Amino acid sequence: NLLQKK
Amino acid sequence: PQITLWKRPLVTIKIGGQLKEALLDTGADDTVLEEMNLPGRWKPKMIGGIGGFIKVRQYDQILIEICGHKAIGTVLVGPTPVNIIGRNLLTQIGCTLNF
Amino acid sequence: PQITLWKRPLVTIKIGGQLKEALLDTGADDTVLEEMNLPGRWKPKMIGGIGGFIKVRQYDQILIEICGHKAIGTVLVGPTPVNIIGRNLLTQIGCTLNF
């Protein structure tokens, strides 16, 4: 589940 | 609608009564929401990505409204940093990537 | 092209003359690739995903082709489960979400 945030 | 990707694709959803904000996430197999109660029985599951895995509760046959489009499917609930709408529900509303 | 979401949106990319597979990921702010070597200097970046935070190497102004579309931008390198094309490069190729 490849949500990614800075 | 057509949604550009200059900013995070956040939308309003409706689930179990509650109105929530959620991210349309083409990289997610599954839909994962922050802790909440849902009706029916559930079973535990582990899901992974950047940072490793988290344990979530899996509920099946859950009804959701996404931008007013009704969709039914599995919804996972647990300590996700953000509400995510994954492919399992994106397909149901006819969402596609286009370029 | 128009890409539906019944399966993972995996496409071919080219970087440093090498073909790799990567996920078109609207839930990702940034592009994150598996361990590999890139030219020039890097700087540190912390990114968050479903399982928590990881440290990655930030390389700027990197040439990368995605489904034949050329992009030049920031590429992060680190222990991602899969190569991911994030919004920073999805915007460069003119990618939108549609339903």
Side-chain angles (χ1 to χ4, degrees), chain C residues 18-47:
Chain C
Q18 298 174 12
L19 304 179
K20 298 168 167 280
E21 182 173 79
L23 189 68
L24 304 180
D25 188 355
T26 60
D29 296 342
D30 312 300
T31 292
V32 193
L33 302 185
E34 305 156 10
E35 281 300 328
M36 63 172 302
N37 287 117
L38 291 174
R41 288 178 62 81
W42 60 276
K43 66 188 189 183
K45 192 174 177 71
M46 268 262 288
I47 59 170

Side-chain angles (χ1 to χ4, degrees), chain A, chain C residues 25 27 29-30 47-48:
Chain A
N1 301 290
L2 276 318
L3 136 115
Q4 179 274 343
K5 94 291 186 106
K6 293 201 254 276
Chain C
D25 188 355
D29 296 342
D30 312 300
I47 59 170

Side-chain angles (χ1 to χ4, degrees), chain C residues 76-93:
Chain C
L76 313 180
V77 178
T80 179
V82 59
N83 296 316
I84 66 171
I85 306 302
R87 290 187 301 94
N88 76 304
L89 307 182
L90 296 172
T91 53
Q92 293 202 17
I93 71 174

Side-chain angles (χ1 to χ4, degrees), chain B residues 19-75:
Chain B
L19 284 184
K20 289 184 176 279
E21 183 176 82
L23 179 68
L24 306 177
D25 185 351
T26 59
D29 295 337
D30 312 297
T31 293
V32 196
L33 304 179
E34 66 201 337
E35 281 293 350
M36 68 178 301
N37 195 25
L38 287 172
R41 56 205 298 96
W42 56 269
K43 62 184 174 190
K45 183 178 173 74
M46 284 278 268
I47 57 175
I50 295 298
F53 288 76
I54 55 164
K55 188 178 71 173
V56 296
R57 305 193 308 282
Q58 174 181 336
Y59 295 86
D60 294 335
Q61 302 175 13
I62 299 299
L63 177 59
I64 201 167
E65 285 186 36
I66 305 159
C67 304
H69 289 74
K70 284 186 264 178
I72 186 155
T74 294
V75 172

Side-chain angles (χ1 to χ4, degrees), chain C:
Chain C
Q2 170 168 280
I3 298 167
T4 59
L5 298 172
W6 306 96
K7 303 174 190 290
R8 289 173 181 161
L10 296 169
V11 301
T12 301
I13 63 164
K14 182 167 72 167
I15 186 172
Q18 298 174 12
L19 304 179
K20 298 168 167 280
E21 182 173 79
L23 189 68
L24 304 180
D25 188 355
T26 60
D29 296 342
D30 312 300
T31 292
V32 193
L33 302 185
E34 305 156 10
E35 281 300 328
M36 63 172 302
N37 287 117
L38 291 174
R41 288 178 62 81
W42 60 276
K43 66 188 189 183
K45 192 174 177 71
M46 268 262 288
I47 59 170
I50 200 77
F53 294 94
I54 64 169
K55 295 179 187 184
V56 293
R57 303 199 304 284
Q58 178 176 335
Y59 297 84
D60 293 330
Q61 205 161 348
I62 296 299
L63 298 262
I64 176 168
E65 197 181 279
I66 304 154
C67 291
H69 288 67
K70 288 169 168 278
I72 309 176
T74 296
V75 167
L76 313 180
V77 178
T80 179
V82 59
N83 296 316
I84 66 171
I85 306 302
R87 290 187 301 94
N88 76 304
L89 307 182
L90 296 172
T91 53
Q92 293 202 17
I93 71 174
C95 191
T96 55
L97 284 168
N98 297 268
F99 57 95

